[PDB]
Amino acid sequence: SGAIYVGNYRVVNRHLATHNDWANLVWEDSSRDLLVSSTTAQGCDTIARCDCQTGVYYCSSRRKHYPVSFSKPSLIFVEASEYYPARYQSHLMLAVGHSEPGDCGGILRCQHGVVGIVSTGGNGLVGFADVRDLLWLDEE
Numbered sequence: 001s002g003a004i005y006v007g008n009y010r011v012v013n014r015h016l017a018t019h020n021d022w023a024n025l026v027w028e029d030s031s032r033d034l035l036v037s038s039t040t041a042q043g044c045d046t047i048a049r050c051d052c053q054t055g056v057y058y059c060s061s062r063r064k065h066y067p068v069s070f071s072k073p074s075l076i077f078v079e080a081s082e083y084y085p086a087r088y089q090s091h092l093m094l095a096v097g098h099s100e101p102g103d104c105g106g107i108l109r110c111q112h113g114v115v116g117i118v119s120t121g122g123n124g125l126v127g128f129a130d131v132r133d134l135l136w137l138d139e140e
């Protein structure tokens with residue numbers, strides 16, 4: 001589990017969104033595994049606006065933050081899980097790292113701020129849903 005709290009937005013994995021998220025929806029995209037809902041309180045996270053390929057992510061199944069090198073956001077085939085059939089997921093970045101289903105939502109960050117959240121795992125790889133192109137998270 002986990003979310004990004006930027007401005008009056010909450011960014012979560014679409015497959016982990018709650019009824020309150022769906023009832024206060026701002027934007028969602030199944031192909032990216034992302035959903036954004038509105039919040040009453042202002043958050044403290046800042047979004048990175050960059051092309052970094054190194055950063056640090058939080059892994060809840062190890063209680064640890066790990067430094068990683070990751071690929072550029074791309075269209076990657078992801079195997080079937082209990083939330084999605086096997087399909088192409090867009091705006092996804094891969095790294096070598098420990099992941100398990102409950103690790104989704106952990107933040108990946110670079111020197112500029114939050115880059116994305118854990119969305120996929122298995123086989124000693126971790127995949128992150130990028131958020132750096134969502135410029136509207138910084139306003140309104």
Ligand SMILES: CSc1ccccc1CC(=O)N1CCC[C@H](C(F)F)C1
Pocket residue numbers: 015032033078079080081082083084089099100101102103104118119120121122
């Ligand atoms: C932490 S992810 C993990 C870890 C070990 C093994 C498998 C997974 C789950 C995983 O890859 N998916 C199921 C949930 C949706 C994900 C993506 F489609 F958005 C795909």
Ligand SMILES: [Zn+2]
Pocket residue numbers: 048049050051052110111112113
């Ligand atoms: Zn960066």
